[PDB]
Amino acid sequence: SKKNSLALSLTADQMVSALLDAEPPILYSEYDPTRPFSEASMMGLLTNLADRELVHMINWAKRVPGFVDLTLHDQVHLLECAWLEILMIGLVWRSMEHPGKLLFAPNLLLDRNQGKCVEGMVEIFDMLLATSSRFRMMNLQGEEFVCLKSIILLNSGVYTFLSSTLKSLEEKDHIHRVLDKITDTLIHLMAKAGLTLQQQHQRLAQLLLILSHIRHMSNKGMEHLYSMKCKNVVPLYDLLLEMLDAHRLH
Amino acid sequence: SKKNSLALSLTADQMVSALLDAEPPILYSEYDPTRPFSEASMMGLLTNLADRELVHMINWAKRVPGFVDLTLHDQVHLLECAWLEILMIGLVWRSMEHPGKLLFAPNLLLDRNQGKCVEGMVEIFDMLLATSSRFRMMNLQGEEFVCLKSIILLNSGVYTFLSSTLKSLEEKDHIHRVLDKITDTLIHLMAKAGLTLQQQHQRLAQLLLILSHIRHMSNKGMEHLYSMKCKNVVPLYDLLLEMLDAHRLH
Ligand SMILES: C[C@]12CC[C@@H]3c4ccc(O)cc4CC[C@H]3[C@@H]1CC[C@@H]2O
Numbered sequence: 026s027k028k029n030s031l032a033l034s035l036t037a038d039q040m041v042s043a044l045l046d047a048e049p050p051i052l053y054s055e056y057d058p059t060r061p062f063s064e065a066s067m068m069g070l071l072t073n074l075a076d077r078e079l080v081h082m083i084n085w086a087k088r089v090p091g092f093v094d095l096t097l098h099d100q101v102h103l104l105e106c107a108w109l110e111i112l113m114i115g116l117v118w119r120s121m122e123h124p125g126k127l128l129f130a131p132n133l134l135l136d137r138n139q140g141k142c143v144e145g146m147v148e149i150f151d152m153l154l155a156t157s158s159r160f161r162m163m164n165l166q167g168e169e170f171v172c173l174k175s176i177i178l179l180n181s182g183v184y185t186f187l188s189s190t191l192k193s194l195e196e197k198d199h200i201h202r203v204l205d206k207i208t209d210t211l212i213h214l215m216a217k218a219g220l221t222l223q224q225q226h227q228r229l230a231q232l233l234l235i236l237s238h239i240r241h242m243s244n245k246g247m248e249h250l251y252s253m254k255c256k257n258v259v260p261l262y263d264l265l266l267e268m269l270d271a272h273r274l275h
Numbered sequence: 276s277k278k279n280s281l282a283l284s285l286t287a288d289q290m291v292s293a294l295l296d297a298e299p300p301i302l303y304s305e306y307d308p309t310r311p312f313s314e315a316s317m318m319g320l321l322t323n324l325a326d327r328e329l330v331h332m333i334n335w336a337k338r339v340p341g342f343v344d345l346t347l348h349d350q351v352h353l354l355e356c357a358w359l360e361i362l363m364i365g366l367v368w369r370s371m372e373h374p375g376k377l378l379f380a381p382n383l384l385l386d387r388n389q390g391k392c393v394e395g396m397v398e399i400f401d402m403l404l405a406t407s408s409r410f411r412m413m414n415l416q417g418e419e420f421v422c423l424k425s426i427i428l429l430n431s432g433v434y435t436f437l438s439s440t441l442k443s444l445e446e447k448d449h450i451h452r453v454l455d456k457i458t459d460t461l462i463h464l465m466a467k468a469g470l471t472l473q474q475q476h477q478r479l480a481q482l483l484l485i486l487s488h489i490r491h492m493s494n495k496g497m498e499h500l501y502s503m504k505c506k507n508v509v510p511l512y513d514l515l516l517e518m519l520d521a522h523r524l525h
């Protein structure tokens with residue numbers, strides 16, 4: 026009984042202006058450029074931004090096409106299975122124009138060094154800078170971004186729903202369908218820019234292949250946060266703590 | 276000074292028969308269906324297969340196009356950054372036709388249960404079965420496979436080379452170039468099968484998106500192996516131990 030929402034009908038353009046209108050606000054950090062960041066100082070500073078930003082992401086999710094067509098539990102699943110990936114593909118986007126620096130917030134701008142203020146934090150920053158950089162090198166257009174962002178919320182953690190029943194397959198299928206359309210939007214947005222057919226193909230792959238690395242930075246970065254929490258350096262942010270105690274990583 | 280190898284010229288077809296001829300042999304396990312698998316018993320049984328299989332993978336790598344065009348150190352980097360992903364996209368391929376079971380070796384065939392013989396092992400098996408299953412659901416053709424396999428060896432761990440110099444960018448660029456061609460091979464192999472343009476696009480994305488999950492299973496599965504080694508359940512297989520002490524995961 027595979028239903029029919031709005032997502033599936035949307036014109037390749039509406040699809041865009043949809044995800045585009047959907048975009049959440051750009052938060053701001055509250056630190057005081059006085060006290061020198063300590064391992065703890067920055068962690069808290071970041072995790073704070075994370076936790077808050079995480080509140081808008083939930084709302085963002087609801088606006089993504091086909092997303093509410095899933096079962097509530099399955100929406101939460103997707104959400105908590107990709108939250109960190111999403112937090113990062115955003116960061117990398119914001120950091121596009123500022124090479125060598127990650128624009129966490131317009132008021133909080135860090136570089137490869139600050140990263141060293143926290144253990145193991147460095148490597149990640151570099152991976153984020155590399156992805157950050159790579160995007161810029163392809164001249165990633167804002168429309169493509171929101172497409173990717175959406176693709177993560179829908180792909181990451183789809184093969185692992187709670188279910189393995191019968192309504193699980195319907196769902197698993199709906200998502201695949203929306204994703205297929207998101208692909209059309211992307212391919213479209215690329216022809217609407219000159220790219221040869223060959224180029225469209227290639228650029229598609231190139232973008233999707235970044236999603237591999239992101240997925241990767243998400244795993245490594247998650248193990249990290251868990252560690253900082255085991256060192257009692259992380260503030261008690263229940264939302265962030267939830268999206269973490271969700272991966273059960275040990 | 277971006278060189279010009281053979282890879283870049285290859286016809287979309289040669290590209291295939293290249294990777295296809297490149298394929299390594301299908302190993303075999305040596306266990307005795309007598310003694311009941313213990314957490315340790317199977318781990319050793321698997322890790323043994325892993326370690327050995329890992330020997331052919333190295334040789335396989337050399338045969339992949341554009342791969343030897345890199346710097347030796349960079350080849351090792353790629354190799355040790357994706358070894359596990361590769362070991363898995365293979366497993367999943369072998370397990371295609373046997374739903375609910377992972378065909379590690381033609382003589383060693385396990386199911387969702389045996390997985391439970393080892394701690395945390397289960398979840399992974401399921402993820403592998405899901406991917407295993409998903410492939411079958413798309414009727415993944417052997418040619419596409421070898422394409423993916425190659426794409427992993429080249430993409431996974433490219434944004435993180437030793438270098439961040441000047442010869443690093445050349446390299447990083449060559450790979451991107453070969454990858455772009457591997458994309459052409461794929462898109463080609465799909466038109467050579469009827470698929471509309473739209474379908475080619477869509478199926479491309481669909482395959483590449485699996486690579487996200489694989490990357491994921493690789494991270495989680497790696498953390499696992501490290502754990503078993505911390506519990507002294509893993510045999511001392513120096514090659515396997517090398518490709519692990521390479522991720523520095525803690
Ligand atoms: C989760 C971490 C703190 C919060 C960081 C953050 C915080 C906010 C945000 O929008 C993106 C990111 C990306 C990387 C995250 C980090 C990865 C390592 C660290 O533990």
Ligand SMILES: C[C@]12CC[C@@H]3c4ccc(O)cc4CC[C@H]3[C@@H]1CC[C@@H]2O
Nearest residue numbers: 321322324325362363366496499500
């Ligand atoms: C590395 C592990 C043992 C070896 C397993 C293997 C061994 C051989 C092979 O060809 C593929 C795989 C995939 C999953 C691997 C497992 C992931 C968890 C476990 O620690």
